[PDB]
């Protein structure tokens, strides 16, 4: 088995106060729903939003979503908010080693 | 409920050529499922070791972990200079898969 590589789409963005941001990881193997997004804030670690790719975080606004099962993941955040700005990523829980997408760095334009 | 992770120290600096040590506690016992992650900056973690011991592949020999229960120690023998990053441990026994607050490693 190869490790599995998680594509995320894009590599940064900005957007503006109650914008959709849209970010997308596909899997280079079925990964059935094991996928969890993250955000990360500068010198904090990965906090989780989405887990099991669809399943909102005990505590986590309904502002952010996750769709998708297999290969092709998409996270959502319907209104952006500043407190949101931070660096998002997917991982893999299907298999060790447990791997991360690169990241979305999030700003406000 | 979430099983705590307490990683200390939060940064250190040190040398080329030091041996540094960080360490995780658990909160209740997690047997040997303990991940320790390295992020260099601006970049994802990555997985380096596995099973409180086992490394990954390419992982130089200089890193080490040890430790099992709730008592974890994660060892850089000789400190290089691409080895300036953000560690993190993860316990793996019990969902959430939850992380330690992470060790910014600098050189001095």
């Known amino acids: 088995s190869t490790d599995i590589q998680m594509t995320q789409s894009p590599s940064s963005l900005s957007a503006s106060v109650g914008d959709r941001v849209t970010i997308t990881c596909q899997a280079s193997?079925?990964?059935?729903?094991?996928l969890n997004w993250y955000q990360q804030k500068p010198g904090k670690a990965p906090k989780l939003?989405?887990?099991?790719?669809?399943?909102?975080?005990t505590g986590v606004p309904s502002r952010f979503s996750g769709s998708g099962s297999g290969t092709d993941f998409t996270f959502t955040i319907s209104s952006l908010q500043p407190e949101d700005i931070a660096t998002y990523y997917c991982?893999?829980?299907?298999?060790?080693?447990?791997?991360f997408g690169q990241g979305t760095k999030l700003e406000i334009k | 409920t979430d099983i705590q992770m307490t990683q200390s120290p939060s940064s250190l600096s040190a040398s080329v050529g030091d041996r540094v040590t960080i360490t995780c506690?658990?909160?209740?016992?997690?047997?040997?499922?303990?991940?320790?992650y390295q992020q260099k900056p601006g970049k994802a973690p990555k997985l380096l070791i596995y099973?409180?011991?086992n490394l990954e592949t390419g992982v130089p020999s200089r890193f080490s972990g040890s430790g099992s229960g709730t008592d974890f120690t994660f060892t850089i023998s000789s400190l290089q200079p691409e080895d300036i990053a953000t560690?993190?441990?993860?316990?793996?026994?019990?969902?959430?898969?939850?992380?330690?607050?992470g060790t910014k490693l600098e050189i001095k």
């Open positions: 099973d409180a011991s």
């Open positions: 991982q893999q829980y299907d298999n060790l080693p447990y791997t």
């Open positions: 193997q079925d990964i059935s729903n094991y």
